Amino acid sequence: SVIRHFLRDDDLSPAEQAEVLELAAELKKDPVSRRPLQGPRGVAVIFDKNSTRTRFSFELGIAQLGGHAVVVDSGSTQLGRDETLQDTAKVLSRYVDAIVWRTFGQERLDAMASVATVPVINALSDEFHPCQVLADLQTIAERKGALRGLRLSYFGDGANNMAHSLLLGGVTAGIHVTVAAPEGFLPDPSVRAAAERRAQDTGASVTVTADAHAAAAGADVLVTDTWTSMGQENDGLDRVKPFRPFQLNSRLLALADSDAIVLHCLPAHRGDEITDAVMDGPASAVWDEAENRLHAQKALLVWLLERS
Amino acid sequence: VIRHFLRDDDLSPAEQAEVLELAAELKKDPVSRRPLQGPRGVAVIFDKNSTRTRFSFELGIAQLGGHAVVVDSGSTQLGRDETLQDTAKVLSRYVDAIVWRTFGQERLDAMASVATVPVINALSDEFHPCQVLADLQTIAERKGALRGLRLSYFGDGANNMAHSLLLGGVTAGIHVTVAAPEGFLPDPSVRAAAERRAQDTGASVTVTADAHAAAAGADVLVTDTWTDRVKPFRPFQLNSRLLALADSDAIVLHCLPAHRGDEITDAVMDGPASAVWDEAENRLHAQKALLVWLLERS
Amino acid sequence: VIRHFLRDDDLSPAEQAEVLELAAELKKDPVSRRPLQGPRGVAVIFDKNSTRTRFSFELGIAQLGGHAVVVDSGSTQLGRDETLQDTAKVLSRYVDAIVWRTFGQERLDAMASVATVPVINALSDEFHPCQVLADLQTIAERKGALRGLRLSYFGDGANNMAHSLLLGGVTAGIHVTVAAPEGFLPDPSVRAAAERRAQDTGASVTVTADAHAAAAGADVLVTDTWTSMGQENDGLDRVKPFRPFQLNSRLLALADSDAIVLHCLPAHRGDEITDAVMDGPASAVWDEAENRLHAQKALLVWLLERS
Ligand SMILES: [O][B](=O)C1=[C]C(Cl)=[C]C(Cl)=[C]1
Ligand SMILES: [O][B](=O)C1=[C]C(Cl)=[C]C(Cl)=[C]1
Ligand SMILES: [O][B](=O)C1=[C]C(Cl)=[C]C(Cl)=[C]1
Numbered sequence: 028s029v030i031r032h033f034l035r036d037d038d039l040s041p042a043e044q045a046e047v048l049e050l051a052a053e054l055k056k057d058p059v060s061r062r063p064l065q066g067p068r069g070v071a072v073i074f075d076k077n078s079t080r081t082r083f084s085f086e087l088g089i090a091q092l093g094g095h096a097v098v099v100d101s102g103s104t105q106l107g108r109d110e111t112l113q114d115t116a117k118v119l120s121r122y123v124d125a126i127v128w129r130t131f132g133q134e135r136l137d138a139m140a141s142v143a144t145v146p147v148i149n150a151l152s153d154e155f156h157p158c159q160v161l162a163d164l165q166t167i168a169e170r171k172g173a174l175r176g177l178r179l180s181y182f183g184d185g186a187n188n189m190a191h192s193l194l195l196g197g198v199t200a201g202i203h204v205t206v207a208a209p210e211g212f213l214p215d216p217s218v219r220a221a222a223e224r225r226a227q228d229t230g231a232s233v234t235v236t237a238d239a240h241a242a243a244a245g246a247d248v249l250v251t252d253t254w255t256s257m258g259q260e261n262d263g264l265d266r267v268k269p270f271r272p273f274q275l276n277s278r279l280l281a282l283a284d285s286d287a288i289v290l291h292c293l294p295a296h297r298g299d300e301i302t303d304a305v306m307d308g309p310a311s312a313v314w315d316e317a318e319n320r321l322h323a324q325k326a327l328l329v330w331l332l333e334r335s
Numbered sequence: 336v337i338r339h340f341l342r343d344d345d346l347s348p349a350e351q352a353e354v355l356e357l358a359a360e361l362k363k364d365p366v367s368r369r370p371l372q373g374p375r376g377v378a379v380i381f382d383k384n385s386t387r388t389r390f391s392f393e394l395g396i397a398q399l400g401g402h403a404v405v406v407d408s409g410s411t412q413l414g415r416d417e418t419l420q421d422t423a424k425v426l427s428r429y430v431d432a433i434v435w436r437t438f439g440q441e442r443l444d445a446m447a448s449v450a451t452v453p454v455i456n457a458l459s460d461e462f463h464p465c466q467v468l469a470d471l472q473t474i475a476e477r478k479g480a481l482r483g484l485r486l487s488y489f490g491d492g493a494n495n496m497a498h499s500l501l502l503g504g505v506t507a508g509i510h511v512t513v514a515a516p517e518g519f520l521p522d523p524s525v526r527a528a529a530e531r532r533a534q535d536t537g538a539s540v541t542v543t544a545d546a547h548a549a550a551a552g553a554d555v556l557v558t559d560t561w562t563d564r565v566k567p568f569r570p571f572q573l574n575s576r577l578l579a580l581a582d583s584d585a586i587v588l589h590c591l592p593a594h595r596g597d598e599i600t601d602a603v604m605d606g607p608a609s610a611v612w613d614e615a616e617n618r619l620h621a622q623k624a625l626l627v628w629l630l631e632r633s
Numbered sequence: 634v635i636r637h638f639l640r641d642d643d644l645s646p647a648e649q650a651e652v653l654e655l656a657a658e659l660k661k662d663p664v665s666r667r668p669l670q671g672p673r674g675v676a677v678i679f680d681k682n683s684t685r686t687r688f689s690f691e692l693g694i695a696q697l698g699g700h701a702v703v704v705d706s707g708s709t710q711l712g713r714d715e716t717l718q719d720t721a722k723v724l725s726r727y728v729d730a731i732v733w734r735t736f737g738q739e740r741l742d743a744m745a746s747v748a749t750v751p752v753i754n755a756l757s758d759e760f761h762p763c764q765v766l767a768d769l770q771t772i773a774e775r776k777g778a779l780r781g782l783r784l785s786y787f788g789d790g791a792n793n794m795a796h797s798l799l800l801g802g803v804t805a806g807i808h809v810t811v812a813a814p815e816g817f818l819p820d821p822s823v824r825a826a827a828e829r830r831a832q833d834t835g836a837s838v839t840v841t842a843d844a845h846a847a848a849a850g851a852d853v854l855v856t857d858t859w860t861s862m863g864q865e866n867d868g869l870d871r872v873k874p875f876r877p878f879q880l881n882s883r884l885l886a887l888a889d890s891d892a893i894v895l896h897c898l899p900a901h902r903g904d905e906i907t908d909a910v911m912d913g914p915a916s917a918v919w920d921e922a923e924n925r926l927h928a929q930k931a932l933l934v935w936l937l938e939r940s
């Protein structure tokens with residue numbers, strides 16, 4: 028069998044994404060019904076930069092599949108330093124049944140996935156957050172039913188990992204995705220072109236705009252995320268003034284469809300990209316969205332393991 | 336309906352007796368109760384690390400069928416990157432209980448007011464209630480019934496063990512004495528709090544600088560680390576002289592680690608009255624009992 | 634009697650054979666032995682962290698049904714806030730074995746003299762006995778019987794791998810050669826213990842500075858990094874003396890034609906070993922890394938059986 032990896036959202040075809048999302052719903056209802064890692068078989072969960080939320084979700088999810096997550100945190104000689112990345116993929120492929128990796132540049136994920144003989148999953152990277160978007164789509168489906176034809180709008184930094192993954196994973200689900208972002212903060216051209224091509228296969232569409240009010244009008248789902256990652260705090264930019272018109276506040280939510288829901292990859296900086304009234308009001312799905320990381324990541328693992 | 340255990344008086348006398356009975360059953364049959372089979376998760380969070388607390392909870396949760404997700408001080412500082420309540424609301428979807436080691440109580444109190452799973456104080460700057468459950472289990476297995484026993488704590492009466500021996504001790508019906516120098520006395524709000532549960536159980540609270548008098552007739556002698564800034568405690572050192580004043584077959588307890596030669600001597604630590612090794616082991620069983628009991632009511 | 638494994642010769646030749654046989658059985662059936670079902674705990678303690686050691690022990694203990702409680706170097710170092718004796722006594726009530734990565738051998742000895750559960754040396758300054766069990770497992774699967782084999786180690790003759798290959802190798806009946814430059818020779822006490830144990834097994838011990846002679850006729854070539862982290866500030870040029878001892882293609886071609894190459898990872902490609910040797914058909918470094926898992930499980934199973 029070809030070893031399948033999940034490094035970016037378009038790694039799943041539209042039909043394959045639907046299978047994973049269906050499995051996520053079944054695992055949410057019966058969370059110990061699938062035990063492909065019974066033994067326990069090991070899964071490596073590797074952090075180039077620590078992420079407590081990602082670790083909790085994967086550590087527990089892997090255990091509920093029967094397995095044992097072996098967590099390697101950032102303070103451990105760093106992948107690439109004491110050994111080549113390819114030496115590491117070679118030995119890890121003897122110990123564990125899958126490799127879950129939080130890292131920085133996409134080229135590192137690609138390099139690992141080209142030599143590892145077990146599935147590699149991008150837990151979170153600078154360019155994509157594919158597992159969060161699987162959880163997002165699971166949450167939207169719980170609240171709204173069929174994903175096909177929904178209109179989703181993302182606000183804020185249009186070139187961070189969530190904007191890119193909502194583009195790719197959203198159009199893979201048949202969702203019309205709009206990114207509202209100020210000039211200079213637009214999606215990467217390669218990602219935008221991949222999303223446009225993928226949207227052709229599903230009947231979806233990609234829109235990029237600097238008009239937040241237009242992006243909010245008629246939306247079924249409004250999404251935002253922090254305006255600045257930890258790496259960007261030293262980039263020299265004023266990263267507040269450009270984004271203030273894109274704040275997801277009560278006024279912006281009122282422009283959307285009356286049944287609209289709100290998503291946000293946690294943590295939120297309340298008062299910046301989103302307000303308290305929105306975060307804790309009735310349209311917020313952020314808490315279900317956080318919980319669903321567990322189920323969507325378990326489903327992705329079950330799916331990749333049985334294909335590999 | 337969502338019960339927390341942040342202080343020893345969070346349990347009534349009848350409820351404490353329930354937990355201690357369950358700790359004895361779990362010591363005998365350590366894998367017979369599996370309320371976390373799955374595994375279901377339990378968060379174990381440290382604002383400051385405690386290897387002893389982590390070791391005991393990690394193994395115990397696993398023996399209850401679950402999986403402890405340990406978050407160290409570096410990742411915690413609860414409030415690090417999101418509000419406390421934002422953290423409590425998500426944790427309540429992932430885990431079935433939250434075990435937390437933090438400094439002040441006000442931090443503990445907030446978490447418990449919002450979380451929708453039980454919150455447990457693993458160790459605080461003011462209370463160490465799980466250790467006292469392990470102490471009461473250790474006393475019961477060596478002395479029988481707790482009610483009517485005389486326990487004396489020696490040394491720093493202003494630290495977490497002194498506060499928890501007062502509250503947990505009187506809750507079990509034990510006459511508790513604290514022997515401490517004037518500068519290092521119990522917190523007044525804990526003292527009156529202990530003084531009030533003692534009325535319900537027939538126990539009592541005494542605070543003296545008289546170590547000789549606190550040791551005389553004692554059935555259980557307890558001390559703890561003091562930390563020359565360490566001058567006022569050495570008349571309270573639990574040595575062979577003080578112990579010789581106690582009741583026959585008295586036992587000695589000490590939340591570990593012990594600094595041998597300071598608050599306690601080798602002769603007492605390694606002698607026949609010492610129960611400190613069983614006491615340390617019983618954190619495992621008493622904490623499992625506390626978890627089992629909190630989980631089946633919450 | 635409570636058995637410990639602090640150095641390679643803590644197992645007799647017959648006992649080592651039992652552990653190696655178990656390791657082969659566990660590699661075929663990794664979850665069929667559950668002596669730690671419960672889970673019962675095993676303490677895995679690091680005075681200095683070793684990701685490879687923690688990784689392999691953590692997974693291996695889980696596959697025995699147990700739960701590894703890992704105590705890293707961040708946690709207050711053992712012996713600081715209480716006596717090793719005090720810690721040993723309490724650990725003996727919490728876990729069924731103690732796995733410890735520490736520095737001096739006297740610390741391991743002190744722990745094993747007091748603990749009432751088996752103590753394992755996961756890795757120390759003087760010995761790496763678990764890695765050499767994995768090495769012997771690897772040689773057996775690629776060569777057959779171990780008795781009569783000729784193994785040569787190259788590089789720093791006084792590091793933990795050289796000492797354990799000496800002791801564990803002769804216990805298995807292997808003729809062990811250490812090729813090392815002057816001033817980097819095996820500890821005299823370790824060499825004499827190996828020579829004594831060799832008299833029971835028909836093995837032999839050789840120490841030489843002639844790398845070419847050490848490689849001629851060798852069935853197994855082994856090397857290791859030239860410098861541990863605690864040696865980076867020792868003041869020595871730790872490259873120039875070892876250059877003639879590099880495991881390279883020329884050196885390997887002097888050995889027997891089906892010789893295999895071992896190396897405790899990490900390897901510094903270009904220094905003690907070349908890319909062509911690490912990646913060629915004689916290299917067994919990848920199976921050797923994997924066998925840490927199986928050999929350490931076997932050792933735990935065997936120690937728990939007898940304690
Ligand atoms: O980001 B944090 O403040 C945090 C804290 C805990 Cl205790 C658990 C998790 Cl998943 C995250
Ligand atoms: O503070 B310590 O010396 C310590 C050491 C270990 Cl290995 C385990 C525990 Cl619980 C405490
Ligand atoms: O923000 B949170 O406290 C949180 C916690 C977990 Cl365990 C998982 C996620 Cl996705 C978020």
Ligand SMILES: [O][B](=O)C1=[C]C(Cl)=[C]C(Cl)=[C]1
Nearest residue numbers: 073099104110684685688
């Ligand atoms: O030394 B390291 O590069 C390393 C990395 C991982 Cl991901 C796992 C292990 Cl065991 C070691």
Ligand SMILES: [O][B](=O)C1=[C]C(Cl)=[C]C(Cl)=[C]1
Nearest residue numbers: 387390591615618720723
């Ligand atoms: O002082 B000790 O070494 C110790 C160790 C454990 Cl695992 C638990 C407790 Cl309560 C004390």
Ligand SMILES: [O][B](=O)C1=[C]C(Cl)=[C]C(Cl)=[C]1
Nearest residue numbers: 115118685688898922925
């Ligand atoms: O070098 B390696 O990446 C490696 C990884 C593991 Cl898990 C174990 C060993 Cl022995 C070596």
